[PDB]
Each structure stands twice: as C-alpha cells, then as structure tokens.
Design a protein around this nucleic acid. Structure first.
Ligand SMILES: [Mn+2]
Length: 664
RNA sequence: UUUCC
C-alpha cells in the first residue's frame, strides 16, 4: 500500500496542530530529554548508594527465591515467576531510539496471519452482539476529567477551568463537528471545534523490563526491544527496518559522568498518545456510561477489585487458562473499529457521533522526540484521517475497545476449540445477544474474567471441559496460534490484573489462591515510572501525588505473597548496607508526612484524622493514580478520594448531550 | 514538561 504522508513541524499541516500559546509551541518543539528521576524526595535513581542497594537486593532475591513456575506456566510455591533483575535500570534514561509508531498495521496483521475481518458469520454476530450489549442501556453520569492532565492538540492546557470549558463547548458542538466530518470537511471540523488534528505522541518509561544473568559469562543481558525507524513506520513495515533499540547505559558515564555499575541498563520506552481533548470529550461522555454498564450488569466478567473478588470466581472452575496477547494495541484491527461503528449505526446511534468515534480511531499522529535529533513529524494527513495505528492509548474509549476485541476473541477460542455444541445457540442477532449476555454473566460452562489484554479463561464441569484441556495443551505446545484474530499464548506465570494465581500441588483452580505479585511491590517501590515532581505545588496534579501512602497499603496488597516477610527483610538489610539507615523507618516517616499533606487536599479529612477512612485501594491510587487506568475504576475508590484526582463537568450538560447521541 | 476507568 501507500506510504503514509509525513509532514515536518515547519509544514502548515503540523503548525496548525499547535495553538498560538507558549505551552503548545513548546510541546511541538520539545526535544529529546533524559535525566535521573527523583525516585523519592531527595533521592536520585542513579545515586550510588541506591544502585548499590539494587545490585545487592536483586542478586540476593534472585538467588534465594528462584521462580516457581511449572511447565504449564502456573505458579506455585514461593509465588515468584521470574528473577528480580528487572529493578536494574537507570530510571529516567531511555533506550535509544524509541520506536516510530507504525502508521498502518494492515501488513503487520497479515504477515502474522491474523484475519482482516470476522472469519465466520458466527464471529461477526458475536462482535456485533458485544456492541449491542455494551452500548445499550446507558445512564448519563458526569464527564470526569483527571486533574492536571493536558488537553493536548491544539491548546495543551492543564488548567481545570479551561479543560471544563473545552469539554462543555465540545459537548455542545460535537454534533455540528460530526456532521461536518460526515461531509468530508475535517479541516473545518478541526478549525471550528478543534475536533481532529492528531494524537500527540509521547514516550513513557516501562521502568523494569527483563534482564537475565548469563551463567557462562557472569554478565547481565537486557531483553532486546525492537523498534521501527521512520521508513518502517510510514510504510507499514514495507521498507526501512525493525531493530533492537540500545539499552546500553555506558554512555551515561561520558555524557553525564554518571557512574554506571555493571549490569545496569537504560529503560524500555513505550509510546503513549494524548488525544485532542475536544474530540475525546464527546467520546468519554459515552465511554463512562458504557463502563458503568459492563462493570455492573456484566460484573462477573469485567469488574475486578480484590484478590478475593477474583478468587471467588476462579475457584469454582475446573480449569483456568491464563492467556497472554502479544502487542495488543498495535495489532488491534481497524476492521473492528468499522464493525463497531456500523453496528452502532444499526442500533440507532447519532451518525454524527459515530463519525466522531470512527475518526478518533483513524487520526494522524504527531511524533515528538524518540531520540536525540529525531521527531517533530506529523504522520498522516488531518484533512482525511486514514491511519491504521491499531488502538491509540489516548483515545477516549481505549480500554473498552481492547476489552470488546479480546473478550470476543477469547470466547471464539473457547467455542472453536472446546465448545462446538454451543454454536447452534448463536444463529442470528437475538440469539447471539442472548448467548453473550448469559456468557458474560458467568452463567455458561465456559467463562472468562478479562480486562483488555489480560484474562483468565474458565471451564466448569461439562462437555467443553475436555476441549479446555486440549486447548491448554495446544497453548503449552505453542506451535499453533489458537485464534485467527490476535496472537494468543499462555502467560508464563499466570496472573490477572496484578495478582498471581498461586496453585498448590494439585494444580487446580479450586485449591489455588490469588496473591499479590511481590515483584510488582519492588517495581513500584524502587523503580517508579516517574520522579516525585516536587516542583509541582499541587500534588493532585503529580503523577505520584502521595508516594508515602503506599507504605500503609503494602501489607494489604502484598501480604499474601509467600515470601513477603523475607522480601521486606532482605530490603531492610540491603538498605542498611547501602544507606546506613532503616528502610522501614524511612518509609514510616514518608508515610507520616504524606498522610499529613493529604489532609490539605481532603475536605472531609479532619485536618489530621488518620487514614482510618481510606481503603487499601484508596492508598495505592493516591500513591499511583495510573492504577486508576490499568487496574481499577472510579467506582472502586472512596468518593472523597476520587474528588482529589478528578473533576466533573455538569450532569445536566452531559445528560442533554447523551440524549442527543443515544438511540433511545 | 506533556496521554485515556
Ligand atoms: Mn495475565
């Protein structure tokens, strides 16, 4: 196919993406930046003591607590699934270069042998039924906005007052914008209502990534992460190249004079996309009600809170298969965007709104700075959005899009390889809807719990069970992809939304339990993805508002991990060796300070009443709001806490907008 | 100095 058109920042098509204000102009030109993060107040991620501590702790834990994962990927025993070398990165210094995002993934899907559409009429009915059950009996709620998040293109505002106006104006003009777009007038819709333009592409750190220690050599080896250069991204991989980014941290020595201990590497960087907020608002105003619906009526499959919440569902199963999807977002199929839109139109959704939604999934991307001297290039033409990047992370319903794709993909897997007898129940729209409605409520012999690309597939006793074992066996074999839609395999060390499924000697769901992933405690405490941003006065606007609070929820979140005690002690000990102080005491102080600071933000918080009213979820979220993105939902957090992090647009304004969008 | 329960 066509190479995607590309425009340098100086071109008028890219200039038009940035308003005439300093923030926007700076965001367009920002060059590649790196530097140690402030892991905790006053402590840099590359401080020699800190790196010395990480070297001792990581070797020690790996030594004493080797992974306990069987050949079917189930974890048992110490609850450890891999070594602990993941903490060995110079946080804040990225691998170079980061990837150019692929402008079209059609070829990437075809070459991996994935389908370019529903392969059978049955699958077509199931994807559409997913749309009818998800988008149908919605209740308006206010549109909530994350504090301090940017409106990206074209204003790049972080001001709540300005964001609320942008959103309200957007709900008011979405209809006119959509209609413009239905007429092919995208430049007009963008110019008049800022609905269009591009996603603003930033690079985020995945702070821990695999590292192994080669026994032969005595040297550590970091996992290679492949990246696409510009030619490759704009040609969907037909030209250019895909190569291993460089994680070597040696350079930090001559560049910054930072001492780099042996076996420490640069961080894996991932692309992140900020959507043009005027376009996302009208999408988010539908998305939230959709979530409220599936997390209530289809709570069994989609609403996951605690380890025990998950556990209750899974222990009733006779077989539990922990799947893995490779690179979900970039393999996500545009044909599903078109199928969902087509079905929304059949259900009676406003065409103008469907068009806004369709366009949000075909938008050009403005690439910032993947490496020193590269970037500042707009991929795709905003005048006629036609990219196929897969799923953009900043689209307003990204989680729902991944969840609809995968939930149906895993059901198909179960039907295809284990439950042929259920096919006669899926004959037309009504029966598809009935069957999927029952399956999602956990009422069938095949079940699943999922969220985007994480899931656990279940079989109760019955006809499908024997097929379930053959599927599992097929996955263990790993030679044949069990799905025509995405690359599915089994998770090496089964886990679900952060909890590892700990199996005893019987290796059966009924006697298994969900424990916290101890390695994640270590990633969160010693390799955060951001520094403490102590320069940002308003903590509610920071990426890590109250880091100290996580100490208070630690026992609750990881206390069930078998080596919990051991890990806390190895930490205390290495921290002693490295810093001459008690880590525990260090965290109790951090805990007290943040606990006090938090009352400055909580109205109902007696200007010093404890943390008495806060749940463990509340605490993890206050220390790391990102978990509200990949793990929990607004509804899982105390309302007074929710207000610290979010602000809403009037219920009356969203209600009126939603009435003009929905069928009935 | 920049993203979506
Ligand atoms: Mn998993």
């Amino acid at each position: 196919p066509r190479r995607a058109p590309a425009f340098p920042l100086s071109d008028i098509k890219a200039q038009m993406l940035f308003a005439n204000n300093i923030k926007a102009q700076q965001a367009s030109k920002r060059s590649f930046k790196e530097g140690a993060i402030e892991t905790y107040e006053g402590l840099l991620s590359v401080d020699p003591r800190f790196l010395s501590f990480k070297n001792e702790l990581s070797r020690y834990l790996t030594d004493h607590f080797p992974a306990n994962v069987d050949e079917y990927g189930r974890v048992y025993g110490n609850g450890v699934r891999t070594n602990f070398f993941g903490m060995r990165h110079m946080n804040g210094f990225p691998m170079i270069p980061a990837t150019w995002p692929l402008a079209s993934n059609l070829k990437k899907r075809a070459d991996a042998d994935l389908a370019d559409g529903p392969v059978s009429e049955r699958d077509n009915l199931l994807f559409r039924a997913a749309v009818r059950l998800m988008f149908s009996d919605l209740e308006p709620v206010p549109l909530k906005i994350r504090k301090g998040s940017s409106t990206c293109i074209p204003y790049f505002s972080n001001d709540m007052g300005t964001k609320i106006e942008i959103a309200e104006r957007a709900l008011e003009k979405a209809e006119e914008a959509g209609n413009l777009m239905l007429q092919g007038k995208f430049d007009d819709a963008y110019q008049l209502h800022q609905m269009g333009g591009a996603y603003y592409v930033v690079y985020r750190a995945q702070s821990t990534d695999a590292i192994t220690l080669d026994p032969k050599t005595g040297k550590f080896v970091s996992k290679d992460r492949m990246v696409a250069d510009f030619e490759y991204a704009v040609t969907g991989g037909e030209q250019g190249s895909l190569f291993a980014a460089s994680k070597d941290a040696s350079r930090l020595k001559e560049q910054y004079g930072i001492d780099v201990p042996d076996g420490f590497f640069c961080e894996r960087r991932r692309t992140a996309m900020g959507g043009p907020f005027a376009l996302n608002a009208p999408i988010m105003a539908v998305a939230q009600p959709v979530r409220n619906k599936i997390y209530s009526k289809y709570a069994y499959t989609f609403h996951h809170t605690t380890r025990l919440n998950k556990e209750e569902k899974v222990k009733e199963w006779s077989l539990c298969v922990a799947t893995d999807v490779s690179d979900h977002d970039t393999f996500w199929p545009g044909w599903l965007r078109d199928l969902i839109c087509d079905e929304l139109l059949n259900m009676g959704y406003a065409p103008w709104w469907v068009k806004l939604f369709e366009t949000s999934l075909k938008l050009p991307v403005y690439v910032g700075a993947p490496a020193p001297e590269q970037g500042h290039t707009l991929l795709g033409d905003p005048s006629n959005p036609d990219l196929e990047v897969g799923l953009s992370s900043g689209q307003g319903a990204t989680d729902l899009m991944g969840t609809l794709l995968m939930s149906i993909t895993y059901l198909v897997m179960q039907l295809d390889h284990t439950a042929p007898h259920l096919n006669s129940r899926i004959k037309d729209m009504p029966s598809a809807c009935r069957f999927l409605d029952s399956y999602w409520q956990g009422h069938e012999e095949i079940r699943q719990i999922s969220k985007s690309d994480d899931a656990m597939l279940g079989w109760t006793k019955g006809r499908a069970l024997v097929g379930g074992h053959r599927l599992f066996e097929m996955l263990k074999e790993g030679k044949v992809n069990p799905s025509p839609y995405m690359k599915i395999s089994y998770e090496h060390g089964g886990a679900f939304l952060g909890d590892i499924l700990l199996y005893d000697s019987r290796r059966e769901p009924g006697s298994a339990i969900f424990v916290g992933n101890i390695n994640s405690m270590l990633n969160n405490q010693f390799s955060p993805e951001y520094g403490v941003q102590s320069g940002v006065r308003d903590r509610s606007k920071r990426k890590r508002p109250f880091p100290g609070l996580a100490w208070a929820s630690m026992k609750d979140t990881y206390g069930a991990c078998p080596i919990y005690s051991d890990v806390l002690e190895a930490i205390e000990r290495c921290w002693w060796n490295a810093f001459g102080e008690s880590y525990r005491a260090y965290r109790e102080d951090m805990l007290k300070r943040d606990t006090l600071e938090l009352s400055r933000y909580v109205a109902s918080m007696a200007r010093q009443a404890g943390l008495a009213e806060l749940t463990p979820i509340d605490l993890e979220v206050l220390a790391d709001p990102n978990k509200l993105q990949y793990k929990w939902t607004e509804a899982d957090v105390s309302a007074n806490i929710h207000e610290v992090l979010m602000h809403g647009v009037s219920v009356e304004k969203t209600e009126r907008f939603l009435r003009s969008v929905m069928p009935r």
